[PDB]
Amino acid sequence: PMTLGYWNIRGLAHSIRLLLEYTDSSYEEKKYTMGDAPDYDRSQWLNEKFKLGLDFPNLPYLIDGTHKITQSNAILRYIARKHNLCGESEKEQIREDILENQFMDSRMQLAKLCYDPDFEKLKPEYLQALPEMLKLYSQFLGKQPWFLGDKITFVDFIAYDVLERNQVFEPSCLDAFPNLKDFISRFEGLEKISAYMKSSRFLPRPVFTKMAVWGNK
Amino acid sequence: PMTLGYWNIRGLAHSIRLLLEYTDSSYEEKKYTMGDAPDYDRSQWLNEKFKLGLDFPNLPYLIDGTHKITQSNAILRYIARKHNLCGESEKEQIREDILENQFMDSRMQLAKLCYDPDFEKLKPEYLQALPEMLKLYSQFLGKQPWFLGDKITFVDFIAYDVLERNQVFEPSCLDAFPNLKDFISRFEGLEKISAYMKSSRFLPRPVFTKMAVWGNK
Numbered sequence: 001p002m003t004l005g006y007w008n009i010r011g012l013a014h015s016i017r018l019l020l021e022y023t024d025s026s027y028e029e030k031k032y033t034m035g036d037a038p039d040y041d042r043s044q045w046l047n048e049k050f051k052l053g054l055d056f057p058n059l060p061y062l063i064d065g066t067h068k069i070t071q072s073n074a075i076l077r078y079i080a081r082k083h084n085l086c087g088e089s090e091k092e093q094i095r096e097d098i099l100e101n102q103f104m105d106s107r108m109q110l111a112k113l114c115y116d117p118d119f120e121k122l123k124p125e126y127l128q129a130l131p132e133m134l135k136l137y138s139q140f141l142g143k144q145p146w147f148l149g150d151k152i153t154f155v156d157f158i159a160y161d162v163l164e165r166n167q168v169f170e171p172s173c174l175d176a177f178p179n180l181k182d183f184i185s186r187f188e189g190l191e192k193i194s195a196y197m198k199s200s201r202f203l204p205r206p207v208f209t210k211m212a213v214w215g216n217k
Numbered sequence: 218p219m220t221l222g223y224w225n226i227r228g229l230a231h232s233i234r235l236l237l238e239y240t241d242s243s244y245e246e247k248k249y250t251m252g253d254a255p256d257y258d259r260s261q262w263l264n265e266k267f268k269l270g271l272d273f274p275n276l277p278y279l280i281d282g283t284h285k286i287t288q289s290n291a292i293l294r295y296i297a298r299k300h301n302l303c304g305e306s307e308k309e310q311i312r313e314d315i316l317e318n319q320f321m322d323s324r325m326q327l328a329k330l331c332y333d334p335d336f337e338k339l340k341p342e343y344l345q346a347l348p349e350m351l352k353l354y355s356q357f358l359g360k361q362p363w364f365l366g367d368k369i370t371f372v373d374f375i376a377y378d379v380l381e382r383n384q385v386f387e388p389s390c391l392d393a394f395p396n397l398k399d400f401i402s403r404f405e406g407l408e409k410i411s412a413y414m415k416s417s418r419f420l421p422r423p424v425f426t427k428m429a430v431w432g433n434k
Contacts, residue, residue, distance in 0.1 A: 056319050056353050067311065074314035081307065090298060094284060097291030103271050140272050 005052070006060035007045075007194050008033055009154060009217075010165075011058045014074045014155040017074060017203070021145045022157070023083045029201075032059070034210045073100060079167040081153035092148045099140075099147055110169065114207075114214040130166065130173055133214045136178040137163070144185060152190075160187045164181035165207060169214070219244035222269070223408060224251060224262075225276035226423050226434070229289045230277045232374040234420075236414040237291060240300045246418075249276070251427045290317055297371035309365045316357075316364060316372045323350060324379045327386065331424075331431035347383065347390055354366075354380070355394040362403060367409075377404040385430070 004020065006013040008031040011106060019213045021028050035041025049057045058070040063077065069075050080086050087096040113119060113126045128176055137159070146152045164184050165176050196202060206217030221237065223230035225248040237244050245353065252258025266274045285294050297303045305315040330336060330343045349372040353377075363369045364376055381401050383390050391398045405411060413419060425433030 016320045055357050056315065069311060071313065071315050071318035073318050074311065078311060080306075081310065090295075093298065094286060094291065094295060097294045098273060100286050101288035101290050136273050137275065 002031065003028050003030055003061060003063040005030040005063075007209060008203070009091070009209055010204055011209070013162045014204075016060060016062070016072065016079075018160070018193060019085070019154065019157045020027050022190065023079060023085070024192070025079065028042060035073045040209070040211050041152045061180055073104070076154050076158065087148050090155075093139075094147055096153065101157065103155070103158045103162050109133075110166065111208070112217075114169075114212045119213040125169060131176065131209055132168065134163075134166075134173060134177050134180060138180055139169060140165060141179050141183060143179075146183075155205075156183075156187065160184065168205075168207070169203075201210060218242075220247055221245070221277060222247040222249065222280075223306060224249050225420070226426055228423055228425060231421070232378040233277060233279070233289060233292050233296070234289075235410065235413070236296050236302070236371065236374045239407065239409045240302070242296065242297060251303045253427060254300070257426075257428055269413065274359050276281065290321070293371050293374065304365050304370060309370075313370065313372055314356075314366055315373065320372070320375045320379050324382075326350075327379070327382065328425065331386075331429045334430060336413070336430040346388060347387065348393070349391060349393050351380075351383070351397060355397055358396050360396070363400075368386060373400075373404065377401060 002020070002025060004013065004027055005200060006029070017029075019025075020185075021125075032042075032045045034044075045059065052061065052068065054068050054070055056070050060070075060072060060075060062069045062075045064078075067078070077086075079215075087093040090104065090110055097205070109126065109129075113122050116122055117200055141147060144150070147155050160183070163174070163180060167184065188197065205215070206212075207215030210216050218364070219242060220246055222228065222234060223246070228396065233235075234246075238241075249259075249262045262276060267282050269280065269285070271278055271285050271287055277287075277289055277292065279286045279292045281295075282293070286295055294303075304310040326343065326346075333339055345377050358364060361367065367373065378402070380391070380397055381404075386399065391401070395421050405414065414421075422432070423429075424432030427433050
């Protein structure tokens with residue numbers, strides 16, 4: 001079937017794995033392992049990086065027959081397009097493109113902090129800015145069950161990931177924003193998702209690679 | 218008409234401006250100025266940041282009637298969808314999604330170097346890495362006039378920007394990659410483009426904000 005290659009990490013493959021699971025996609029996961037010692041060995045990946053036929057070899061990568069895809073957003077969009085989990089009106093396509101990029105911005109702010117040796121000094125700073133961020137997502141979701149209204153689409157898999165992951169980092173962050181909390185419960189409530197989370201193939205942690213100072217493994 | 222708000226910089230608005238000119242779009246530019254002294258005064262933007270009705274207030278923004286849009290890729294996509302400067306087949310949509318994100322990564326590698334105070338120490342590393350980056354883009358463009366084949370699309374506006382920008386940073390970088398050189402020439406040769414470049418509203422520099430150690434103004 002399909003092939004999803006990535007580190008044995010949650011990271012950029014989380015929303016991908018959930019969507020594949022949700023759409024009932026048939027796939028195999030090629031999971032790469034990293035070293036621990038001062039040399040975080042990546043030979044397992046680098047050895048076949050150029051032998052899979054990728055135009056821009058990267059992790060994660062999806063291979064579906066003739067289609068070799070890299071870049072997590074392109075991979076999501078690909079599966080999304082195949083199952084109609086995309087925005088329909090231009091109104092919805094706009095929100096989609098905004099959130100797709102907005103979440104990628106949020107995702108990267110956590111990543112920067114969690115890989116920085118000065119994590120301890122920088123963390124409080126992050127936490128003070130976090131509620132401004134969460135407020136805008138809250139404002140945007142409103143009374144809607146999903147981010148583009150009534151129908152679940154690919155952005156919700158992205159949203160879930162970056163929102164839920166912040167809740168592990170700082171457990172109480174979403175408490176002031178009920179609708180965000182409910183979103184997380186509603187997503188996890190979805191039949192295909194809950195069933196997957198109760199399986200042994202889940203993998204919600206480690207969040208980051210072994211080189212991170214937080215959420216590393 | 219439309220409104221494009223951004224710093225008085227080339228930056229992330231470059232490819233949007235070009236695409237607006239090319240599509241014959243009518244628009245006004247709300248350009249913001251930054252401070253000089255150790256306090257890079259951004260009050261000009263900050264004062265109205267929350268008064269324009271943006272969901273996720275940010276620069277650049279595009280307001281088109283009821284449509285308020287932030288995130289440069291969402292703005293590009295909005296205009297492109299309007300004038301059909303997008304990919305049609307899934308094959309084209311894939312290359313489009315890959316490229317959008319791949320170009321965004323390239324754009325960010327240069328930005329990080331040029332805003333870094335250790336710029337003079339880091340520049341050598343970037344330069345030795347650049348020739349792997351451009352080769353992948355040559356490989357991908359091949360003998361096609363534009364990145365999705367024969368029809369020009371939005372990714373070409375992104376492409377031109379980051380490729381041409383590297384040529385300003387390092388004049389000889391595209392030397393080994395003729396098709397990339399020709400792409401730049403072909404892009405600049407487009408009627409609406411050349412005309413715009415010969416106008417007083419072009420603004421190809423500064424490349425980065427006043428805080429950049431390179432390309433700053």
